[PDB]
Design a binder for this molecule. Sequence first.
Ligand SMILES: Cc1ncc(C[n+]2csc(CCOP(=O)(O)OP(=O)(O)O)c2C)c(N)n1
Ligand SMILES: Cc1ncc(C[n+]2csc(CCOP(=O)(O)OP(=O)(O)O)c2C)c(N)n1
Ligand SMILES: [Mg+2]
Ligand SMILES: [Mg+2]
Lengths: 669, 669
Amino acid sequence: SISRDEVEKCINAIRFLAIDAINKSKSGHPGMPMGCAPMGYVLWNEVMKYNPKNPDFFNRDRFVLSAGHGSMFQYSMMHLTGYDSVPLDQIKQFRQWNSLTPGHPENFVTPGVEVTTGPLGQGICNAVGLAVAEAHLAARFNKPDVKPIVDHYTYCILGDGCMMEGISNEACSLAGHWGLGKLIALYDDNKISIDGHTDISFTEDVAKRYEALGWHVIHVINGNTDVDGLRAAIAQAKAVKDKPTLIKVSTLIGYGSPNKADSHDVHGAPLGPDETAATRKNLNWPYGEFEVPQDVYDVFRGAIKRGAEEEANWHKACAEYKAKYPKEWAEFEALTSCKLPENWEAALPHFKPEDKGLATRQHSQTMINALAPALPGLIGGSADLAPSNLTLMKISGDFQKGSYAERNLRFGVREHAMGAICNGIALHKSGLIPYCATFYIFTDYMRNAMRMSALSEAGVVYVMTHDSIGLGEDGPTHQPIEHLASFRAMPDMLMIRPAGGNETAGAYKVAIANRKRPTTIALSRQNMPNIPNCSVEGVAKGAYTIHDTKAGVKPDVILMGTGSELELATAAAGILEKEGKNVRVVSFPCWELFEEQSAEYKESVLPSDVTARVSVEAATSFGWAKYIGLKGKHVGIDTFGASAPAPTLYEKFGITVNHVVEAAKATLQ
Amino acid sequence: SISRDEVEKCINAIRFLAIDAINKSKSGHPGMPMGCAPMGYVLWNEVMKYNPKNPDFFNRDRFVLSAGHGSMFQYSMMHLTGYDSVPLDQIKQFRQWNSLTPGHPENFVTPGVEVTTGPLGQGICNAVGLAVAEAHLAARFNKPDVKPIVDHYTYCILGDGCMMEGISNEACSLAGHWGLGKLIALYDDNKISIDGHTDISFTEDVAKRYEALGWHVIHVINGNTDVDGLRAAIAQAKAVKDKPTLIKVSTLIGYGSPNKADSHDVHGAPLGPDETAATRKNLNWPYGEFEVPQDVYDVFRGAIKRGAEEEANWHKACAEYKAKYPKEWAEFEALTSCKLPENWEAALPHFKPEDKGLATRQHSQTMINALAPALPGLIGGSADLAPSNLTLMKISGDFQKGSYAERNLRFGVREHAMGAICNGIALHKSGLIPYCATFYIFTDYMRNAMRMSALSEAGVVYVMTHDSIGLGEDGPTHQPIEHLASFRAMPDMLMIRPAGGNETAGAYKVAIANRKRPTTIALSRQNMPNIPNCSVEGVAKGAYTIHDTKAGVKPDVILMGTGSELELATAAAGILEKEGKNVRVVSFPCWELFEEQSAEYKESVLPSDVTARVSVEAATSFGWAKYIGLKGKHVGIDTFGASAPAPTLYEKFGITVNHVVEAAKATLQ
Ligand SMILES: Cc1ncc(C[n+]2csc(CCOP(=O)(O)OP(=O)(O)O)c2C)c(N)n1
Ligand SMILES: Cc1ncc(C[n+]2csc(CCOP(=O)(O)OP(=O)(O)O)c2C)c(N)n1
Ligand SMILES: [Mg+2]
Ligand SMILES: [Mg+2]
């Protein structure tokens, strides 16, 4: 193949592409890409299997840059190996408006970028999810007497910042526990973070911690020039079937810069023109700005013929499989196509007012079990709360290292990693539909991962029980107050709060339909009735009318409610009606969906000339003015809660039928 | 001395007080308290130095229950040893309205409870902070010549949940890095969590991970009956000065219950009548409901005498210290009183409009440096972003194992533990004023800790820079959108967004005065002018008027802005005024403070008959209807951002002077 001198020229081409891009943008991070260039060379030219001309090739290795600030590293590699989403012109538009080379890698913008990173620690956890998906599909579909149709590795580059974040310890505890032997993490061990040398705050023995988590650990003491040792480490990682592998690769940040290498000044500011000149001279690099010599392209652009071959070979393995296993093939194809099975929505049961009330956590359990046999891709579970959140799929066992084909994911007390893992599962783009769960209050532990589902267009289903003071005695550390508001404010997240059976089914219907946008479902601990006119379809409208006192007669006062509080509005309406008032009750299960409706629909629910308006929800008034206006009133709770039985809490905090009636009268003047 | 038999009676009294209390409430967690009773007996009767009749005794050892679901354990020990906050009638009111025995321990309700737990992992981190406070004060004030005036240990009991949470790895990494030898953590290694046996999701080698983090580890294989071994273990921990110590104590959850021990069924539900009778029989306990034998009280109530004597001996040591070191004593006394120095607010600078328009992050650095000499208790720092958040106190070094007297805390990339550690520092109740910092977007990593500051009444100052799209090219993973709304919605948190120098000084003034309520301050990356009539005092009003076209005449239109966008409102005002409109501009730095003002004040700023209202803020419209109404308009950004230079982002997303003008025209109808 080719020489050490050519390998070195290839390595330096990665460094100077990154340097020159960041000097032109006047913004970004040259240090990590300079220190990691040798790893790039090996991974892209020699190890990973991928098709640069088909970023969606199902059986490709997955790469994740968890250290997302080094985005020029990944962009350089993609450019060099011939991805059409990163031509030279896009290298020259790093960090500019509408480029395909944003400051941190974004899956939703750049074909070949698998997940969105930037928030340290997310990527490694996304990688654990990508490896979960590969292990699961492999266990479900590979057969011992033909070539596999699922067989690929998951590679992740991460730095010191990822290693300090708690979320990465969570995810990597789970990866050890699951024995995910095709996950290979490469740690850029460069002794530098933003504050300076890592000895200022970070002296732990990372390798020992990883051994404790159940990982194999390989030490590459010279990541700057030991290409043979990186080749050997990666080969050894692949021969460890049984445990995930951490390759601790010691580098100099900004390797090549004579004056700024090994300093935090090369972390995150361009080298600039004098040091750039000095680095060119120090690395013996006579090529001009953005000039990659053609012989380096000849090397890396070899990925194209290799990638076409790998993909053709896979198609042959699939043809051979399909010949002996036509039924299993059909199921594999239908799942990995990402198309939802025809009529899956018909699996959802329906309810009537006559049916005795259940908690929406119980309805949720019903929907998960109704859907699981209809949706082969449904996978997931709770963060140590299965007997409370009610999330188990009865038709499957527990995903474990003995048993990867099982579909219940048991995350333990690891909310944050759980959300990020689910992002990886979704973004494998294999038809897996991940759901995860905890008490709604503990969305606070996993908030960045949830925001990441929204930003990266990953249809993760967040199943969040015990949604209010209705949980009772556990008290204010466990009772949501600001949570609904905090999610309504978040861009591109659906926040659904169903009242009764039909609305819970309707929440799940929205959630499953939405394969490119996450849905958070707030569910009750306590029973609620099935209220007349509540419906599956109404949830899809976001807000809809469930009661008018007289057809064709404009309401005097509009009462709007969600979840367990909808019954307070319907009961208040009956009291106000018996007095002589005309009342509309509106159910408001999903504010985002309401805002997508036509102006005429919105006006049909909340007529602009009826300004007597009351909202009822066991949560803060914050946000509700959007619908209740300045002259309206909220019945809810804006303070923290308390430790007492639920019925006492509703009484003491004034979240009662009588309060809604009183507020309505106040709005009427 | 005390007999082995009598020690066993004492341990069983703890078990049955917990059991009996939980059966009466019909709610709560008997399993942990049953498994951990032997560790309670040893800690309370033999190890810890405390005065049950003075829960504020400055030199007490601090205990923290990180596994806060086992609250009846702590309440039983406090009752038995004579804390007046937990008489028997309060044990009989566990989890009931307005009791001093809430379902999870709350510092803000029960004197003697040091912090609030319930959310797994918080407590251990709070313990790291309490230990940081002791070490810092001991280094600052102890002299080699006389007895110490600061010398106490920090004990923490935590379980498997706490161990699984990433937050605890973060804080224990720092505890090891800082060599906090007076932190002693007792791990309830019971192999049980809510989902069942821990092997379902948690098989890591915890002991080896703690060794990697820099801790001493001691194994107690029989925490159920080996009292001598617990005694030895704790003694050995007090003799390792150099490292924090984890004592891994294996117990049987629910020890004593012949049918429900070692099962998740004893985790979280009362034993109930049949199993309680069976457990009484199995443990040979003839005493009735809530009946603690006289001889067991005679033992635990020994704490009263011992405590009086410990505190008196401390006073002697302080009298001896003060006789030799009058200067130092006076400083110690003044700090530790928690009273702020006379006229500390005069330290803060004032600004005029033609002063150079700095970023509010630069103004924040000025305030930090202004206050550090004036406020002896100011302590804290950034999560690896000192050079970008601009948070260093120039007059001090870095807190480290060699140098505990220094005041800058260098947290590394550990936002969540950083907040919880600060809660522990503040809640030491020794006059330390902690501040901590990251990019505002990463509040999402640390959200529960921040919430616990609010709930626990800890005046942590959250210094949060890069508050918007004004940061530019790092793009949407770094750009806040929903974050101002998400904190305005949080109970008992101040969310301040200062425009200019004076407002930034004003934000700091609020934040310092608030020792019992946290303050989050959203600060800009980018420069902004000092606007005429912006003021230190106006921040305290929450919203205030900075411009009227003509004094004494009602505005036609009200423009309200915050932070970097306030200049858009002022610039718009001028344009509207040239068209003949009378315009009022209102700066809105803190919503919570505005809502504290009188009805007359609020009406003076926002007259209820002027409905033409525009808000401008580079964040979502969510929430603003509270002030803008149904008829007003918001100029901001409700979507995620993008990776480009900041000026391009403002133009592209329409956050411009001319958009505010057109919106004001639209509201005028
Ligand atoms: C969760 C989170 N916290 C903070 C930041 C801000 N930030 C960006 S890079 C960085 C330092 C990371 O150091 P390291 O991963 O070792 O990168 P190197 O400087 O070695 O390239 C930080 C703190 C971030 N991106 N995400
Ligand atoms: C952050 C957080 N997530 C979830 C919970 C819900 N919860 C309460 S106790 C518990 C499990 C406790 O396991 P462990 O700490 O081992 O306690 P044990 O059952 O052994 O007493 C959980 C998951 C919580 N309290 N906090
Ligand atoms: Mg580094
Ligand atoms: Mg346990």
